[PDB]
């Protein structure tokens, strides 16, 4: 058995979580990181 979590769902490689997917980090612009911090990774489907 096997217990894990979907995309969408906020991970961190140094926080010992197991995703059945691969974390994505986007690299998108920072205009604003006041109200939208362009710099965290999330769990999604591996490619």
């Known amino acids: 058995s096997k217990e894990c979590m979907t ?3 906020v ?3 140094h926080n010992h979580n197991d995703c059945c997917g ?3 980090c986007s690299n998108g612009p920072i205009a604003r990181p006041w109200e939208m ?3 965290n990774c999330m769990c999604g489907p591996k490619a």
């Open 22 to 24: 691969s974390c994505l």
């Open 7 to 9: 995309d969408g769902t």
């Open 11 to 13: 991970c961190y490689i």
């Open 37 to 39: 911090m362009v710099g």
